[PDB]
Structures are given as C-alpha cells and as structure tokens.
Amino acid sequence: MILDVDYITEEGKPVIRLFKKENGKFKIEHDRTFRPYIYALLRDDSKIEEVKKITGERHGKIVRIVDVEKVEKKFLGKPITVWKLYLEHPQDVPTLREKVREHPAVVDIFEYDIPFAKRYLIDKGLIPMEGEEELKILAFDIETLYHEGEEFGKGPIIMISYADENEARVITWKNIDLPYVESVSTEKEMIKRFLRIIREKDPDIIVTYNGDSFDFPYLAKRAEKLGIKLTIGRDGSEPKMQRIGDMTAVEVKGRIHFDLYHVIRTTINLPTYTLEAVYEAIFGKPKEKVYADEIAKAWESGENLERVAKYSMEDAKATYELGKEFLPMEIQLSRLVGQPLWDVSRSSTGNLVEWFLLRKAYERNEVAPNKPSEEEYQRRLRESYTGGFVKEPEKGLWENIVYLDYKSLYPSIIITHNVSPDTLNLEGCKNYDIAPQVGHKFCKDIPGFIPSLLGHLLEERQKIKTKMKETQDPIEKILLDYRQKAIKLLANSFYGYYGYAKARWYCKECAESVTAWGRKYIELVWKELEEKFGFKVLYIDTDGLYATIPGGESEEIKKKALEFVKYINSKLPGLLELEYEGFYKRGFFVTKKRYAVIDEEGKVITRGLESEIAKETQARVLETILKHGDVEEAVRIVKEVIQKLANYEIPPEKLAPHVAVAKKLAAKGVKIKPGMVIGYIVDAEYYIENQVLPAVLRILEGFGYRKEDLR
Ligand SMILES: [Mn+2]
C-alpha cells in the first residue's frame, strides 16, 4: 500500500520517496530516474534548436533547460504536437517557464504548475491507499486553561487524551481516581507519555479534529518552551506546518495526519460543526459543551475535574469514532483521484475533480488546459451563471401527494448530450444536439472528454450497487457501499465544476446548457403528467416535483403514478430518468423553498419553515394541519394565544436583551466574555408580534389569512 509521496533534494537533485505500507512492513522507496517538465506549443518545430538555450538563475546558481525531445498529444480532442522540455529540479520550473511563453516561437506552454510528487503518481499511474492492509488508527485531543487573556500557549496543557480500538485514555498531571486516567508528575511527563504512546502504538493514520489549527500547533508552542522535541513522525521528527488553501496544515512524516474537521464540513450541510454538533447528527446520542469551567484546575483546584476528565476521554472517543466513519469516504476519494489522503482530505470537492481530470488526461494522452490567469479568473467571479427551476406552488392543503425524482439529472444530461467544452460548437461536426434555450451546440461524432469519463463513473457505480445486492460478506458490503458513495459524490460535482472559477476545464456554456436542458425535461414531465395522466402538479424543484389528482382516491394515485413513470421514461432520451420517490399523506407548499408534508407513518419533513411560546405554538399549528387536516382548529389555536398573552396567563417558563443581563451575574466573579456558557432568560406587542405571529405567520400566508383578525 501507499501512503504518501514527497521528494527530498540530494544536492541540486530531486528525489521521490514513497511511504509504502507492506505486509506488516513499513517503508521507503526513493526513486531517482524521474524528472520535472512542461510542454511548449510551437510555431515551427524547426525552432527547437533556438528554444533550448534558455537560461535561468536560481538560488545564486544557474538553472537551465535539460533534455528536450518532441512529442504528439491531443488538446480538447484535436491532435496536436508539442515540445516536452524537461528539467532538473521542480524548482527550476517557476524560473524557466516565463522565459518560455515569452519566446516568439512559442504559442503556449502547458502543465507548468503541477506539484512534482503529484505529477509523479499521475505519470507513473500509482494510486494511494490501494491495498487492504489494516491501518492503525489513533486519535487524540488536548485540553488547556484559557488564561485571563489571549496568547495561545501560555495556558498549559491540562490534559491529553487519546483513543482507538481497545481503549481511550487521558493522560494528566493531577490526581483523579479514574480507571482510565493516568496521572504523571508534570506537564513535561504528560507530553512524554503521549510521545511514548504514539511509539508503542505506532499509528499509520493519526486522527484529530481541528488538530491542524489547534491540537498540533498548541503542542508545539508549548514545547518550543519546555525543552522537548515533538518526536512524532516515524523518522523521529516533529510535526511540520505546510501551505495549502490559504489556511495552514500539518503533515507528520511516515504517518497521515487526517484532521476530521475539514472533511465533515462537506457531506452533511450543518448549522455549526462543533464536535458535539457533528457527533449528534451522524449517530444520534448527545454530548456536553461550552467551557472555561476548567476551574477544576485553576486555583480552585476543586474536583469536578472528575467531570472534565470524562469530557476529554470524550473529545477523543468521539473524534476516533467519526474518523473511522468519515475515513473510508476519503480513502475512496483518494483512490479514485490517485493522490494522497493528507492532501485529498484537505481540498474542496471542486478540486478533487480537477485532480480527477489531470489524471484521466494523462491516461488518455490529452494536455491539460491551464488554470485561469488572475484576469480570466477575475471575470468568472462574475456571477449569475443560471440554475433551473424553482416556479411557485399550487397553494393549499393537499392530500395523497406523490413525489417524483430524476435519477441524477445533471450527470445524466452531460452524458446524454455529450456536453463538454471540447464538443462545444466544434467546427464542422456532422451529428449534434442543441441546448434548449441558448442554442449552444454539442457535437456527437465522438464521446466528449468529461462525458465518457462520467459515463464510466456512472457505469461502475451500477456494478457496485448491483454486486452489493448479491453479497453476504458484510465486510465486502460496507466497503462496496463506500466505493459507490464516493463515485457518487464525485459524479455529482461535475456540474459545479464547469462553473468553477479555477476549473482548468471551465466552460460556462457547458454549465448553461445542462441547466437549461434541465428545464426542458422537467417541463415535459410536467406537461405529460398533467395532460396524458390527469394529475394536478403541485410544485416543481430542480430535480423533481409533487403531484396528485385532487380529491383522488389514494392507492390509485400511487398506482397511476407508478404507471406514468414507465410511460415517460420511454419518452425521455438517453439516460434521463424519473423515479417514484415517496408518498405523503398531506402537505402544502407555501412558496419557493418553504413547504411541509407527513408520510403514511406520521413523519414530518419540512424545509423552509421551523422562544418557546412560538416553538410550542408553531407546532400545535403544524400538528392540526398535517396530522388532523384542520386549518380552523389551528387559527382556533393562534387565537386562544394571541389571547393568553393580552390576557397575561402563561407560565414565565417558555420565554428564555443581549448584554443586558451581565447586569447582575457581575456579582459572581462572572467575568463573562463572548465565549462562556449562558442559557439566560429575558412587551405584549412582542410575544404576540415580534414573536408568535411571524412564526405561525409564514405557514399561514399559505392560506391567505393575515396578521389582522388573527390578533
Ligand atoms: Mn503527501
């Protein structure tokens, strides 16, 4: 197996190193028969002897242009010949190139900014995390004392916890009568246990949580000070900070520092991403947090520290557990992409796709277009591309509603009309379809670079969804489940790619035509659904829509629906396809992205809607409409409220303005600052107006009523 790749310089020369993991062995391969490079497009290959002499001048030394044999590739489909001008060090590159696009004989230069080790795995076809070796996973978190003010690292490290598959400890330097804490004389020794531990344990992957930004550099700052090498890599070297997106990461030699944070912050969209926030969302249970309740430590070394311990063993076990979960996704994106996980982990899906293409461009012998200049890229931030539908809803309480899904509408549009910058209004094609409203024309005589790739992603995703339904090893099954969810994440992000400012394969027209092609099928389904099948369409949304037959009998609407889906697929082109998503006993659609519904089994989904006078009231409202089908009873419920408020009869309990009550807490040494737990309590025109009404008032526009009377 592979884990990583980087290069060292052994004097004026670059060397690739491979961290392989191999049958309980761990090691290093250095390869030195590999060299840096770029392409030059040329005026007349004849110059070749003129455009080699190009000198540089780096480090107080002379860069030059080593060996330069001629090659034949393809660009956007078109065969085209060019000059592979090789080099010596990948740093000879940033110093050579400008001299070259600035030479009269050269038209363009290409692939001039690919990091070396990345260029290495792609050109040699190597894929990281490939095997099926048992990686050793270890997670850890640390706990501090946020001093009176803010330096970062004046607060000692109160605790150091860690976790894995056998246990989860906490290492600390105070006394705590717990079976899973380990006490050690000082904070110097705490750090040492930790080091000795990663030594006995020796993990291949170390999992943290915002350890990039916190756990790791806190540790460092707090040792460049206490006289202790953070001997954490496998070559017995310390964690090292590395540049990435503008923010700043930590690679750890021989092991893989995988920082949960950057990874979660993607799949499931989330209000906040506190560990607790995250830990809940994915397996339910709950946690505990908002601190500086470290009083247990500070003078006032009162117990309760027993509490705090519990919490560290927690920060970890949680961290470990999400890691085990969110990790296979990333192992897989790394695998599809052909790059390394400390890397893969830290890049937008936008980017994973780009490496997905640099790699599929080498494999099929196609020069990669260059990234955008600052200017071409300045434009792009120019907006408004164009995304499909959202038309307004047939208002009203409806019942026996049916929801119809498009099986991956965009990956499907792209594949079917061969939408691609490289098929785009290409000259003299003989076969071609035309983008609905904007006339862009995508040729059809030849697959299209992204279309064939996408088609192949979708085709391998079916071989996995299919093999699963067949498998009894539950190990193979979850693993396959992983392969698929990744291909899926990836296949689904090409749309946005086309729209990406920095995509090398930018093509806003490819993006407009999909969106637009998107509108035409929706409609069509919408027509057909209403005309040929007598349904009233209730509300369309970018991939699908809700429908029914007013007053219609319910296990008929289902069956007419079922029926209509097989009617339509036969009318839809290539691989466009609708599917039957769900049946909801009732629902109503206020407007654009506000609406609600409940299924045959009492569950309520609502997006766009949702104090405790409102909370309790907006919900009684909801029950009545959904569960008991009644609009009156609920106004009948806003009323018996707008009136217990102007009558004044409701527990002083459902109310829990800012700033304002660090107005009495000022006695308790309660030196509150914008980061201290506070679940604090706080008109008539209020409660009824700034409060109750707006929260029951959106739902209701939906039936026309209005604040007045309501009052
Ligand atoms: Mn790496």
Ligand SMILES: [Mn+2]
């Ligand atoms: Mn923590």
